[PDB]
Amino acid sequence: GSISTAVIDAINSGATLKDINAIPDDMMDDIYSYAYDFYNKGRIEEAEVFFRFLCIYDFYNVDYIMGLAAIYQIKEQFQQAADLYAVAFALGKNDYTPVFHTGQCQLRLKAPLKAKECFELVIQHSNDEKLKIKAQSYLDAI
Amino acid sequence: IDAINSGATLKDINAIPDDMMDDIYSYAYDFYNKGRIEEAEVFFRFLCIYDFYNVDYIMGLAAIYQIKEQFQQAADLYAVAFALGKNDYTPVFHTGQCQLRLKAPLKAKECFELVIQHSNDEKLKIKAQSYLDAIQ
Ligand SMILES: Cc1cc(C)nc(N2Cc3ccccc3C2=N)n1
Numbered sequence: 001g002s003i004s005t006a007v008i009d010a011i012n013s014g015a016t017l018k019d020i021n022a023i024p025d026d027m028m029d030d031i032y033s034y035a036y037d038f039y040n041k042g043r044i045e046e047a048e049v050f051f052r053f054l055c056i057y058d059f060y061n062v063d064y065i066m067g068l069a070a071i072y073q074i075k076e077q078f079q080q081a082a083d084l085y086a087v088a089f090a091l092g093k094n095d096y097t098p099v100f101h102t103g104q105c106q107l108r109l110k111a112p113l114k115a116k117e118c119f120e121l122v123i124q125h126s127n128d129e130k131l132k133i134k135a136q137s138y139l140d141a142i
Numbered sequence: 143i144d145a146i147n148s149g150a151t152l153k154d155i156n157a158i159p160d161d162m163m164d165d166i167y168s169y170a171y172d173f174y175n176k177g178r179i180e181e182a183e184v185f186f187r188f189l190c191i192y193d194f195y196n197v198d199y200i201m202g203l204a205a206i207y208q209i210k211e212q213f214q215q216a217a218d219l220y221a222v223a224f225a226l227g228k229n230d231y232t233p234v235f236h237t238g239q240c241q242l243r244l245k246a247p248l249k250a251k252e253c254f255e256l257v258i259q260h261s262n263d264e265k266l267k268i269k270a271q272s273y274l275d276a277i278q
């Protein structure tokens with residue numbers, strides 16, 4: 001998947017498509033919009049291909065990673081979703097939304113202590129009051 | 143070959159026994175500790191080809207890249223290592239070091255602050271605070 005592509009690219013250290021600026025930002029923006037058009041219409045398989053394409057070109061982009069993580073969560077591929085949400089958090093250290101979703105994934109993966117840790121981080125550190133309520137509702141059930 | 147075509151790791155198919163993999167990891171660390179950086183790099187690349195999802199294998203390769211002053215390449219792997227491990231902030235600490243070397247002090251500060259705020263590793267937090275104390 002996207003993560004193995006990122007690791008392989010790092011192992012090989014060769015020039016990537018991003019290193020040579022193979023696709024301009026404006027075209028990448030257009031493809032992202034097309035990807036979400038597919039998603040919004042229920043064409044989840046095509047949206048997944050487009051998000052995979054974006055994550056091959058520019059893996060270290062929070063917007064691309066979050067879109068793919070959400071698709072995996074919808075598809076109940078909870079470990080892949082959790083791994084990508086964690087990448088998104090590392091890329092965007094001040095948004096606890098991916099931490100909240102990681103917690104949901106961990107609960108579905110039968111890892112309630114990991115889930116609890118995720119939800120507690122939201123409560124302690126997020127300034128999104130609505131996200132905090134949602135995190136607390138999961139904590140109340142754990 | 144089937145794993146190449148299906149994206150599965152060599153670890154997934156048990157291509158090398160577990161104890162032999164332990165030995166290879168220990169030999170990689172031995173090269174690293176002895177300053178045999180070229181050999182350590184070969185060995186950590188070998189390990190990461192074998193199991194791209196092994197956090198410690200990735201951390202070894204990232205450390206090599208950081209020692210070699212390939213700071214962006216190190217930071218990229220550290221982000222993966224962090225994500226696969228979920229709750230180990232050591233890769234975030236090293237990313238902060240890389241960002242300082244890349245002349246991105248605001249990014250580094252965010253890394254060290256995240257370590258302070260989330261890590262339960264008191265020795266790691268002490269190191270992170272020492273970097274924060276120095277950031278202008
Ligand atoms: C493609 C897709 C599909 C669905 C159901 N959600 C998303 N995303 C993207 C995103 C970015 C930042 C914060 C949250 C989210 C989020 N839920 N993306």
Ligand SMILES: [Cl-]
Pocket residue numbers: 110111112113114115
């Ligand atoms: Cl658990």
Ligand SMILES: [Cl-]
Pocket residue numbers: 082226227228
């Ligand atoms: Cl995990």
Ligand SMILES: [Cl-]
Pocket residue numbers: 245246247248249250
């Ligand atoms: Cl900066």
Ligand SMILES: [Mg+2]
Pocket residue numbers: 033034036037
């Ligand atoms: Mg749009």
Ligand SMILES: [Mg+2]
Pocket residue numbers: 160
């Ligand atoms: Mg074992």
